Structures are given as C-alpha cells and as structure tokens.
C-alpha cells in the first residue's frame, strides 16, 4: 500500500474537496465520526482504502487531506459541518483576507508568508506515510488563491518531494458562474508556472458542468452545491482505482504512463455518463453500449470541445457497476464503425478498461439518480486545445490594453511575467497542433 495526500486550495478546491470526501466516506462505509465497522483491523492496516485514510488507535479513519484558504468562511463550513469529526484542526488552514482574485497577491504577497506553514502541515501528513505516492491538488484557475498560491505550492512540492507524482483537478473559468473579469490572466499565469510541476491535470470547465446540471438534472440555476456533487462523482471515478482493489491505475505514476506520452500535453479530457435526474420517477437503465456511446457525445464532456476534429494519444474507460468485459468490447467495436476516432500514428489504437463492480454511490438527498452502471472515459485528445485557444484569446484582448495589469504589478509581479506566461501558452498551443494535424 502506498499513500496519497490530497490538497485543497481556495474556495473551489475546498468546496469540491468537501464533496469528494463526503462521497469517499459513503463509498467506503465510513461514518461522519470516522468509524468504519467493516474495517476489522483496528488502529492500522494496509488495505486499498488506506491510501486515502489513516487510522487512529480509537478506530477513526482520518482523510489524508489538507485544506488551505486565505479566508476562513469556506473552511469554517468544514469545521462545523457534518464531517467536522473527520479532520483534526491541523488539517484545516485558514487566513483572514483572501487574494482578491489576484494571482500575484496569492503567489507573492500572501504566498510568501504562508508557504512554510502549509508545507509543515503537509509534512506532518507525509510523516504518517510508509510509502507516499504523491499528491492530488484541487484548485480553481480563476481565484487568486487557487491560481497564485497553488503554483507556488507546486513549485515547493517538486523541491521537497522530488520523486513524487502530482496530479491536478483544476476548475476552468466560465462567466456563467463567475463574477471576476481577470480570471483569464490568473488561469494563464498559473498554467505557465505549474506546467513543469504537474504530471497529469484533469480540467473541469464550469460551463460544461453547469449545462449538464440544467440539461440532465433539470436545474434551472445550478448552485455550487449542485456543481460540486456532480464533479465529485467524476473525481471519484478517476481516483477509485487508487482506493479499491484492482490492476489499472493502481498508483499515481500509472496515470502518466497510461494517459500522457508527452509531458507538456498532460490534460486528459473526462467524459461521464449517465447523469440522470433523481426527480424522475423511474428511468430506463442504460446498457453498456449506450453509456459507452455517450462517452463520444460532446454533451457529457467535462470540457466542451469536438474530439471528432482532434487526434487521440490515449483512451481509458473506467466502468462502475454491472459491467462485464464481453459487453465492453462489443460496444467498442460498434462505436469504431460509427464514430470518428483517429489516433496519432505513434500511439496504439487501443483502450485500457477498468471495471469496478460497485455501482456509483449517490449522496442521500442529492440530485443524481441511482444507476446500475456508469462510465468515465479519460482520453488525451488534441481537441481540448480549443479550451486553451479560448482562454488565450480573452487574455490577449485585455493584455493588449494592459487592462488590470497594475493590480498585479502592484503586488510585486513584473509585467514581463505576463508575456512570459503567454508565450509559454503559445508554445503549448503549437505542441497540440503539431500532434493533431
């Protein structure tokens, strides 16, 4: 058994992390007080779920997690919420005033003063590990803390944990649920500084989640709670292989080996199905072929883009529920003869398949209906470069007028970091085009 440490940074990271650990506990049968009756080894063990949970002498299962935010209101929800008993105070780190949606304020001004404390708390979690694999880091692109402090933290993690893998779950900005105009600046600034420190990053576009909640869940105006419960289902599908017995994606290193042949192009596209409204009296249970076919519909992708006009470097299918390999291959064969799936000539045209017999867990009172089988497809497609092009274009519009730049220079950042980051993104878009066309 090898441990994984989860780090949640800023409001988006914390609230999504809260929803994930709520789901993890339900999936592993852990109560809000941290007790786990099914775990017959009291006080210790090296089971698969121990990659994410440590154990105290009293039998409490403690998430291997740190939550960090510069403002306390979001994390105060954790300290007094349902699962307040899961974490001890050392794991929940809060300041007094946030980074004001300013990458430079979070990275330089505030980051300099809190980085050492955050690393100390992380070190305390690492000291409990016999063989730490690495870190899973949750954060927004648009927030000042999510963007600015995350990039500083990732830099220091590469120094203090050189041989450890680091994966990201990153929230790509969408104006429909954002009131900040400078988020394109922050997104490009944090991607530039984090690119060399992240082995694999799962981007979730709030625009995609928002429309899935309106279209599939019949929510006219989804809240962050609606978005986060859906995001946590996708996150859970991705990390399940680390927490349950299996042979696919069993350690963090395997995500890169399976999904990222080229280090800079390390942003796989996630697609999840089915998403069914719980308000429906009863829904027709979709077959393996149907949910697999849904993985190639733009409507259920975590980032809106068109994979018909890109090339694939890798494709991974993660099933949960009543699924047997016979039906998976039958579905894949059918989809090949009907879909436009083009692989790069230097990659094999194949699919890695993982099946977990335990169907998805639904949070009581949530929005999602219980389904007998679900699938999350992770595909490294050049089509996701559409999301970089969109973001880089908004950046260029504002930066041509130096709009809002003084807010960043005022925190000690050099204006040259803007163009340095933008040129890095231009090089990234060029890498995608060289592979996809």
């Amino acid at each position: 058994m090898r441990e994984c440490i989860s780090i949640h940074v800023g409001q988006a990271g914390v609230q999504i992390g809260n929803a994930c650990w709520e789901l993890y506990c339900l999936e592993h049968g852990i109560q809000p007080d941290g007790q786990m009756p099914s775990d017959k080894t009291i006080g210790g063990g090296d089971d698969s779920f121990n990659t994410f949970f440590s154990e105290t002498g009293a039998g409490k299962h403690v998430p291997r997690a740190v939550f960090v935010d510069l403002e306390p209101t979001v994390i105060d929800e954790v300290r007094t919420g349902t699962y307040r008993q899961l974490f001890h105070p050392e794991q929940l780190i809060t300041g007094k005033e946030d980074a004001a949606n300013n990458y430079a304020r979070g990275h330089y001004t505030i980051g300099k003063e809190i980085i050492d404390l955050v690393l100390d708390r992380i070190r305390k979690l690492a000291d409990q590990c016999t063989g730490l694999q690495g870190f899973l880091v949750f954060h927004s692109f648009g927030g000042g803390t999510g963007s600015g402090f995350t990039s500083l933290l990732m830099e220091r993690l590469s120094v203090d944990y050189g041989k450890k893998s680091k994966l990201e779950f990153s929230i790509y900005p969408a104006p429909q649920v954002s009131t900040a105009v400078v988020e394109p600046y922050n997104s490009i600034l944090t991607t530039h500084t984090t690119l060399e420190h992240s082995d694999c990053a799962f981007m979730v576009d709030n625009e995609a989640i928002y429309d899935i909640c309106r279209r599939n869940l019949d929510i006219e105006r989804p809240t962050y709670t609606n978005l986060n419960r859906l995001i946590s289902q996708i996150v859970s599908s991705i990390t399940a292989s680390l927490r349950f017995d299996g042979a696919l994606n069993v350690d963090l290193t395997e995500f890169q080996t399976n999904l990222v042949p080229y280090p800079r192009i390390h942003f796989p596209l996630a697609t999840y199905a089915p998403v069914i409204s719980a308000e429906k009296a009863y829904h027709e249970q979709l077959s393996v072929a149907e949910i697999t076919n849904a993985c190639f519909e733009p409507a259920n992708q975590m980032v809106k883009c068109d994979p018909r006009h890109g090339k694939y470097m890798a494709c991974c299918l993660l099933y949960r529920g009543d699924v047997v390999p016979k039906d998976v291959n039958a579905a894949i064969a059918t989809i090949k003869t009907k879909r436009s799936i083009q692989f790069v000539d230097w990659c094999p045209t194949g699919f890695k398949v993982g099946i977990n017999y335990q169907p998805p867990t639904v949070v009581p009172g949530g929005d999602l209906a219980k389904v007998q089988r679900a699938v999350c497809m992770l595909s490294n497609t050049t089509a996701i470069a559409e999301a970089w092009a969109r973001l880089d274009h908004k950046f260029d519009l504002m930066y041509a007028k130096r709009a809002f730049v003084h807010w960043y220079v005022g925190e000690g950042m050099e204006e040259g970091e803007f163009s340095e980051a933008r040129e890095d993104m231009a090089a990234l878009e060029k890498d995608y085009e060289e592979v996809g066309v």
């Binding site: 009131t179 900040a180 105009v181 400078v182 519009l397 504002m398 007028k401 709009a403 809002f404």
Partner: protein
C-alpha cells in the same frame, strides 16, 4: 470579520451619512437604541462589517462624524437614530470652513485633523481584519471637500494597503450654495484621482432632475435628494452587508482596469412616484436600471463606453429571468460596452429587499461617459479662473495661483484619459 470604517465629513457628508445609517440599520433590524429586533439570521450574518458589538448585545455603527462647525452634527445627534452613534466619535470644531477648500485642507481643517485620526485609529485597532474605509462628503463645500480629502491623504499614509472608498457629491449650478463650488470640486477631484480606489460620483443635478421630472416633486429639497442617495448607498453596499460571492478589494479588482479611472456612475430602480403599489417585473427593473434617467451622475451613457458594469438585484425573484434580461440588455446594446474586456457585465442577487419594495436593482457603471461630468466642472472652473474671480478667499489662506493651474491641468488630463479609451 471584514470590518469597514465609515467617515462622514461636513454638512452634506453628515446629512447623507445619517440617512445611510438610518436605512441600513432598518435593514439589519437595529433600532435607534442599537438593539437588534429582526426576524432573519441573514440580518446578523455580516453585521460586524458596519457595526461593533457592545455589551448587552448592542450594535454601534463603526462611524466617525467630522465637521468644522457644530450645527449639522447637533442635528444628527438629535435626529432619528442620533443616539445610536458612539459619543466619542463626534469630532468637530467651531470656526467653520466658509465653503472654502483651503480652510478645510490647509488651515481650519489642519488644526482638527489629528483628533479625527485618533478616532479612526481607535476604530481600526478594534477590527479583526479591516477591509478599508468609506467616506461620505460633498466636493463643492469646504469641510467635506477640503478636510475630507486631507483626511484621505493622512489615512493612506497610515493605512497604505487598505481600500479607500468615497461617496462624493458633485456640485451643480442648478443646486448651488455658492459660486466657488467648481473651485472646491476641481481641487478635490485631483486628490480623489490619487488617493481613492473607488469613488461613487453623485451629481446633485441628476438627483434634482430625478426628483422633479421622474418623482414629480414640485419643490425638491436637500432631504429629497438625500433619500435617493440613501437608497443608492444601501444598494451598492448590499453585497458587503449580506452573504454573497464580496469585499472592497475584490470589487475594485473587477471594476477598475486602470488605476486613475475609478469613478463610478450609480443607478437605482425602481424610482416611482406616489401607482406605487404596482408590482415591478424583472424586465421593467432591468430596463430602468440601465436608463440614463435612473442614473445619478448626469452623464449620458450612450455618449461613452462601459469598461465594467456591476448590477445587484434584491428580492425574491427569478434569477433565470434576471440573466435573460441582463443578457438581453448587453446583446441589444453591445455598441456601448468595450469589446476588449470580455464578460465585463456582472450580476448578483440578494434575497432581502429594501424596506417597502418587493424587489429593486442597483447599478454600478465604470463608464467613459463620466468625462462629461469632469468637463462641466472644468469649464465652470475656467470661466472664473480666467478672471481670477473669488480667488482672494483662497489666497487669504496661503494658497497660490499655481496650485489652481495645476488642478486645472490635472482634471483636463483625466478627461483626456477617458477620451482615449472611448475610441
């Protein structure tokens, strides 16, 4: 605990400030004696933003009242909620400022300013984490204009990394006390350009026209004008006083793309005359909120371009219908929004409506059309300064002509800066 320290200076500043504290004290369920008697936990969630909690569950506004004569603050202390303010937070002289910026900024004001800062420091020292300051004042007088900007300068020296916000009432010859108002306003505007992060421009001419033409008040008074300012101040601070998103710095970061262009045009809806019980639909709220007649800077938005816009909707309404109407106003008049700041129109909703209304909307625009306001002031300034008229009131306090010429050029530079972003 993101505390804000409120300062009100001079006659206009204290009369509008008194009404502001009367309006939001009602919204938070605070009675004139500082005792809470509301019925919603949302009233206290962010109460510490503007109120300190004293013994016995008493809430005391974090407000400092400043003036160079005692008259207006005597009226406040005897007014409706006059007893709610901290007695030690009244700082006043006896000389008066004679509607003279120099008296407020360099002589009379200079003798009183240290004692005001003592009270400011006291209030700031008891803040868990101070956001910044908000000042209410007029620019056309002497105390609010001259001493108010002196206070801003000394607050920035002592609290350089705190946000400074003002509600600044701009003079107009239509609602004028003295002829030197353009002098005092031009001198103050330069101070604001340098030392505030956000300034709400409230033009007395726009307030008058609203009362006379829209509200159908035959003889508008300063009290009628202040009713509009109170309602507007409550609207633009809703997102600070209730759960949402958030703080002054975040607002500034998304409203101010260039440091000197931080002068906002506020607006309010509905503005109804006494047909006052009729229900107001979301389209009506949205159309009026963007109508020039609902704006209080006396500038035609269709003469310039919006750099950024914030809109706050209050009341139990259809947030789906809000987005549809907002997205309709933009996508129907995009010629007035700069196209190089993507998604520069932001919308927020608050469930608690203002007293007496089922729902309302407040509008905050950073528009290049505000240059018309500074142009009017500049022209009135020059019409007199060309003849050195009334300057003796200012040279008698030690000012030189060169300081007037510098203020003249400073505000014309500001006008030139707005004009380049309008094209």
């Amino acid at each position: 605990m993101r505390e804000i320290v409120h300062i009100q200076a001079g006659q206009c500043g204290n009369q509008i400030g008194a009404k502001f504290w009367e309006v939001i004290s009602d919204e938070h369920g605070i009675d004139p004696t500082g005792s809470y008697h509301g019925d919603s936990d949302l009233q206290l969630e962010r109460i510490n933003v503007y109120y300190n909690e004293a013994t016995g569950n008493k809430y005391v506004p974090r407000a400092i009242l400043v003036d160079l004569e005692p008259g207006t603050m005597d009226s406040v202390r005897s007014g409706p909620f006059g007893q709610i303010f901290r007695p030690d937070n009244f700082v006043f002289g006896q000389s008066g400022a004679g509607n003279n910026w120099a008296k407020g900024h360099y002589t009379e004001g200079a003798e009183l300013v240290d004692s005001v800062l003592d009270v400011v420091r006291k209030e700031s020292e008891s803040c868990d984490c101070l956001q910044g300051f908000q000042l209410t004042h007029s620019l056309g007088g002497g105390t609010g204009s001259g001493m108010g900007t002196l206070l801003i300068s000394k607050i920035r020296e002592e609290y350089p990394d705190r946000i400074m916000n003002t509600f600044s009432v701009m003079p107009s010859p239509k609602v004028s006390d003295t002829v030197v108002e353009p002098y005092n306003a031009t001198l103050s505007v330069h101070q604001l350009v340098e030392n505030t992060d956000e300034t709400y421009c409230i033009d007395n001419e726009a307030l008058y026209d609203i009362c006379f033409r829209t509200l159908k008040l035959t003889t508008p008074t300063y009290g009628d004008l202040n009713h509009l300012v109170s309602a507007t101040m409550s609207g633009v601070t809703t997102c600070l006083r209730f759960p949402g998103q958030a703080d002054l710095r975040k607002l500034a970061v998304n409203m101010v793309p260039f440091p000197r262009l931080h002068f906002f045009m506020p607006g309010f809806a509905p503005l109804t005359s006494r047909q006052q019980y009729r229900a107001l639909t979301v389209p009506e709220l949205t159309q009026q909120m963007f109508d020039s007649k609902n704006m209080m800077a006396a500038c035609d938005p269709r003469h310039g371009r919006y750099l950024t816009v914030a809109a706050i909707f209050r009341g139990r309404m259809s947030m789906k219908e809000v987005d549809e109407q907002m997205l309709n106003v933009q996508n129907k008049n995009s010629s007035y929004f700069v196209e190089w700041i993507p998604n520069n129109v932001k919308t927020a909703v608050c469930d608690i409506p203002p007293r007496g209304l089922k729902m309302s909307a407040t509008f905050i625009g950073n528009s290049t059309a505000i240059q018309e306001l500074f142009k009017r002031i500049s022209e009135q300034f020059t019409a007199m300064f060309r003849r050195k008229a009334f300057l003796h009131w200012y040279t008698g306090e030690g000012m030189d002509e060169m300081e007037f010429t510098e203020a003249e050029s400073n505000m014309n530079d500001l006008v030139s800066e707005y004009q380049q972003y309008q094209d």
